[PDB]
């Protein structure tokens, strides 16, 4: 059972998600993480 918390209409950031919590694994598919700041996506979905 998973929850799609759909995200829309705001301004994100991802550098903050690199140091505060030292994640065990971080595998950015189809997109090199470091460049996530400088492009605008469509209809981001989160799963948990």
Ligand X SMILES: *[C@@H]1O[C@H](CO)[C@@H](O[C@@H]2O[C@H](CO)[C@@H](O)[C@H](O)[C@H]2NC(C)=O)[C@H](O)[C@H]1NC(C)=O
Residues forming beta bridges with residue 7, ordered by sequence position: 44
Of 9 and 22, nearer to ligand X (C-beta) is 22
Give the nearest distance from C-beta 42 to ligand X in angstroms.
26
List of residues contacting ligand X (CB under 6 A): 19-21
Of 11 and 21, nearer to ligand X (C-beta) is 21
Of 13 and 39, nearer to ligand X (C-beta) is 13
């Amino acid at each position: 059972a998973w929850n799609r918390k759909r995200i829309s209409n705001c301004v994100a950031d991802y550098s903050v998600l690199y140091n505060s919590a030292s994640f065990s694994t971080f595998k950015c598919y189809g997109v090199s993480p470091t460049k996530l700041n400088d492009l605008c996506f469509t209809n981001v979905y989160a799963d948990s």
